[PDB]
């Protein structure tokens, strides 16, 4: 009997990284004052100060930006500033009790073939974990993405996953999910965590 | 001279669980039998009781069950529950039956590797790999329920009533009809819930 | 938190480094000069023979093959098989080529982790991961839920050791109720593929 064996699992990665991936809500204003949900995506808490990376397209033209953590807290987020060049954006929240932060190993080098998990909020179903591998680590020549430094992955990505996290089996941030190529299957992209940290730092000081 | 490096494989879980997952066919009369809908099913014990999805065997004149070893039986409807979309069948076989491995003490964790086992598009038994994406929801959500297993192991029509197992072959849940163009978003009833439902059908009906 | 600095990430990078250098981008060019169709191919042996998709190279004026190391060659068509959708190309072997690892005594098992290697949508070589979903599919075929897209045809399906399991063909296309099938692709088993190649080489 298997009663004593151990099921293969990436649960250790989920427990390490998941608590820091938040649900981002873009609220508009209904014709018939009250606020409705225009768009929604994911986001990631980078440090204790309360900074959060997310997608620009998710927060554009937002009357109110709402951020929901997996522990049930809900904050209103301030727009720190977006990047027109890399499609990122940085939010800020004012929390009292301390925050969960995404693990970051600045010395880790993502390799093609590494198992990765996508973490986000597809179709507003609640936080979801999907599993894939890094399919590519940037491109040298000209290619359909127009950029040379995108991580590609086949971890399923859907509307709502944008601005969310892509971690490896250790729960270390590999990148930030963007958009999914659209009848394609298992083709998604992420901004490398190195580049994302630089863009954030810049948007924060500036 | 030739070394014994072995490739990563979830074949152990397949050899353990797969034999107990069956292709379920629903027959109709045109005055000659023919297939109307098909799906998957799971053999729960030696007596020959099988779990499948209710909608798969709705209004069926003859239910047929095909095992992976090539045996084919006629099955009898024992009961059905609309609330949980679960149905139970019964087959009478001479030899022994392959039963799905169950560990009532195992608890499904988010991130566990899982295999979906069923008969998609009637291609024969297919096995696809993914992980547990979620183990239910506390809040109100678009599925309308609070106890669905969500998995990103590919689920297609014909997978309903089939088995979601872990890397050990242990039943985690029963796959149900999955969810404009979503990718890697499927659902299953938790195995604990399913078993309880089945027992009620067998005796109560 | 915790220090994962010395922990090791689960990875199939060993398989990539072994098999990927031998999976090339195939381009069907036509006069108009331009690119008409494109797929993938696999370098089998040092003689410069490559397996690919019959539909990728059909009605081609100039077949081009592109290795990942930057080299680009002009391939000649050795012959194609009507029955199996496999085609064989031949390039200049001078200079040494990367070859796909082959273990002729390895038996694919249902549940084996496999990696597909090809050129989906001309994004550049892409690696996807799945498992052997089934064997001996007659419509012999390996089935796999390693994501396949247009461009993957004629590319490689290899296990975690990087050994060749089969050559990718097309996906499943039949929509039951106006829906899109997911994680269903097929591949000519590596045993059969080798025989087809040998026979096409021999018949040419």
How many angstroms away from the CA of C134 is the closest CA of chain B? 6
Cα gap B18→A75, rounded to integer Å = 47
A138: left (phi over 0), alpha (psi -120 to 50) or beta: left
Residue in the structure block whose two tokens are 């900074």: A51
Q: How far apart are CA B98 and CA B89, in angstroms?
A: 15
A191 is written with which tokens? 């901004």
* C-beta separation of C149 from B51 below 8 A: no
Q: Residue B174 and residue A64: Cα distance in Å, rounded?
A: 41
Neighbours of B147 (CB within 10 A): 14
> Coil, strand, or helix at residue C196?
helix
- CB contact under 8 Å between B123 and C184, yes or no, is yes
Nearest-neighbour CA in chain C from B125: distance (Å):
7
Secondary structure class of C87 (helix, strand, coil): strand
Q: Check if the beta carbon of residue A116 is closer than 8 Å to that of residue A134.
A: yes
Q: Are A144 and C121 in contact (CB under 8 A)?
A: yes
Name which of A151, A122, A118 is nearest A137 in CA terms: A151
Question: Shortest CA distance to B112 belongs to which of B10, B11, B37?
Answer: B10
- Which of B10, B131, B170 is opposite residue A2, by nearest beta carbon? B170
Cα distances from B186 to residues A61, A115, C114, in angstroms, run 33, 21, 22
Q: How far off is chain B from A198, nearest CA to CA, in Å? A: 30
Tell which residue, A173, A56, A49, has the closest CA to residue A104: A173
Q: How many CB atoms lie within 10 A of CB A149?
A: 13
Q: Which residues of B touch A180 (CB under 8 A)?
A: 183
Experimental method: X-ray
Domains in chain B and their CATH numbers?
A: 1-100 (2.40.10.10), 101-205 (2.40.10.10)
Largest CA distance in chain C: 65
Say which residue the tokens 């398989």 belong to.
C15
The catalytic residue among C40, C85, C145, C171 is C85
Q: Which two tokens stand for residue B78?
A: 């024992």
CA distance B62 to B159: 20
Cα separation, C155 vs B190, whole angstroms: 39
Please give the Cα distance from B175 to B189 (Å, whole number).
7
State CA C185 to chain mean position distance. Answer: 12
Integer-rounded Cα radius of gyration of chain B: 17
Residues A75 and A93 sit within 8 Å (Cβ to Cβ): yes
Chain A residues in contact with B139 (beta carbon < 8 A): 126
Binding site feature residues of B for substrate: 143
Q: Which chain B positions have a beta carbon within 8 Å of A13's beta carbon? A: 111
Chains contacting A (3 or more CB pairs within 8 Å) = B, C
Q: What are phi and psi of B28, to 5 degrees?
A: -140, 170
Q: CA A46 to CA B125: how far, in whole Å?
A: 44
CA A80 to chain centre: 17
> Which chain A residues contact residue B110 at CB under 8 A?
11, 14, 18, 129
d(CA B6, CA A8): 17
> How far C81 CA lies from chain A's nearest CA (Å)?
28
Q: Give the pair of three-digit tokens for residue C125.
A: 């070589």
Nearest to A152 among C14, C123, C148 (CB): C123
Query: Would you give the distance in Å from CA A101 to the centre of its chain?
Result: 12
HSE, side-chain direction, 13 A CA sphere, residue C27: 15
Question: Which residue(s) pair with C135 in the sheet?
Answer: none
Q: Quick one: which of B94, B51, B55, B30 has its CA closest to B195? A: B51
Reduced to 3 states (helix: H, G, I; strand: E, B; else coil), residue C50 is strand
CA nearest B190: which of B155, B154, B149, B150? B149
User: What are the tokens at C154?
Assistant: 């004629």
3-state DSSP assignment of residue C79: strand
Gap between the Cα atoms of B38 and B55, Å rounded: 10
| DSSP summary character for residue C187 | E
Buried b (16+ CB within 10 A) or exposed e, B41-54: bbbbeeebbbbbbb
> Could you count the other beta carbons within 10 Å of the beta carbon of residue B78?
16
How far apart, in whole angstroms, are the C-alpha atoms of residue A27 and residue B3? 60
3-state secondary structure chain A: CHHHCCCCECHHHHHHHHHHEEEEEEEEECCCCCEEEEEEEEEEECCCCCEEEEEHHHHCCCCEEEEECCCCCEEEEEEEEECCCCCEEEEECCCCCCCCCCCCCCCCCCCCCEEEEEEECHHHCCCEEEEEEEEEECCCCCCCCCCCCCEEECCCCCCCCCCCEEEECCCCEEEEEEEECCCCCCCEEEEEHHHHHHHHHHHHHC
Q: Report the distance separating Cα B137 and Cα A36, nearest Å.
A: 23
Output b/e per residue, A79-88; b: 16+ Cβ within 10 A: ebbbbeebbb
Q: How far apart are CA C115 and CA C159, in angstroms?
A: 6
In the numeric block, the tokens 């693990």 are attached to A103
Nearest-CA neighbor of C98 among C61, C132, C50? C50
* Contact by Cβ (8 Å): C144, C131: yes
The tokens 């059905």 sit on which residue?
B80
Question: SS in 3 state form for chain B?
Answer: CCCCCCCCECHHHHHHHHHHEEEEEEEEECCCEEEEEEEEEEECCCCCEEEEEHHHHCCCCEEEEECCCCCEEEEEEEEEECCCCEEEEECCCCCCCCCCCCCCCCCCCCCEEEEEEECHHHCCCEEEEEEEEEECCCCCCCCCCCCCEEECCCCCCCCCCCEEECCCCCEEEEECCCCCCCCCCEEEEEHHHHHHHHHHHHHCC
C15 touches C23 (CB < 8 A): no
> How many B/C residue pairs have CB atoms within 8 Å?
85
Distance CA C130, CA A181 (A): 19
Q: Find out whether C88 and C79 touch, Cβ atoms under 8 Å.
A: yes
Residue A172 neighbours by CB under 8 Å, 6+ apart: A17, A103, A104, A105, A108, C4, C9
CA distance B100 to B203: 21
Active site residue C145: no
DSSP 3-state of C129? strand
Structure tokens at C73: 């060659």
* Residues sharing a CB contact under 8 Å with residue B154, sequence separation 6 or more, in sequence order: B116, B128, B130, B184, B186, C145, C182, C183, C184
Q: Are B160 and B139 in contact (CB under 8 A)?
A: no
Q: CA-CA distances (angstroms) from residue A17 to A69, A93, B131, B146?
A: 12, 19, 16, 23
Q: Distance between CA atoms of C144 and C155, rounded to whole angstroms? A: 14
Helix, strand, coil % (nearest 5) of chain C?
A: 15, 40, 45
**Mutate which of A133, A148, A180, A189 to test chain C, going by most C C-beta atoms within 10 A?**
A133
Q: Which entry of A57, A135, A169, A180 is annotated as an active-site residue?
A: A57
Query: Does A87 participate in catalysis according to the annotation?
Result: yes
Place of tokens 């096995």: B127
Burial class (CB in 10 A: 0-12, 13-18, 19+), A12: middle
**How far does CA A120 lie from the centroid of its chain?**
6
Residue C26's DSSP bridge partners are C39, C65
Helix or strand holding residue C18 (H, E)? helix C13-19
- d(CA C107, CA B61) in angstroms, rounded, equals 42
Half-sphere exposure of B110 (CA within 13 A, CB side): 21
Contacts of C182 in chain A (CB under 8 A): 185
């Amino acid at each position: 009997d298997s009663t004593d064996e151990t099921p293969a699992s990436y649960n250790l990665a989920v427990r390490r990284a998941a608590p820091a991936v938040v649900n981002v809500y873009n609220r508009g204003l209904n014709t018939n004052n009250q606020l409705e949900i225009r768009t929604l995506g994911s986001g990631v808490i980078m440090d204790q100060r309360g900074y959060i990376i997310t997608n620009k397209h998710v927060i554009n033209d937002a009357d109110q930006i709402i951020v929901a953590l997996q522990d049930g807290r809900v904050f209103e987020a301030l727009l720190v500033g977006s990047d027109s060049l890399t499609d990122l954006a940085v939010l800020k929240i004012n929390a009292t009790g301390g925050l969960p932060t995404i693990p970051i190993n600045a010395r880790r080098v993502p390799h093609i073939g590494d198992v990765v998990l996508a973490i986000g909020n597809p179709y507003n179903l609640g936080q979801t974990i999907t599993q894939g591998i890094i399919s590519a680590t940037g491109r040298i020549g000209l290619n359909p993405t127009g950029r040379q430094n995108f991580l590609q992955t086949d971890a399923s990505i859907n509307p709502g996953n944008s601005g969310g996290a892509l971690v490896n089996s250790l729960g270390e941030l590999m990148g930030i999910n963007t958009l999914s190529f659209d009848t394609p299957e298992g083709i998604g992209f992420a901004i490398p965590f190195q580049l994302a940290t630089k863009i954030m730092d810049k948007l924060i000081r500036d």
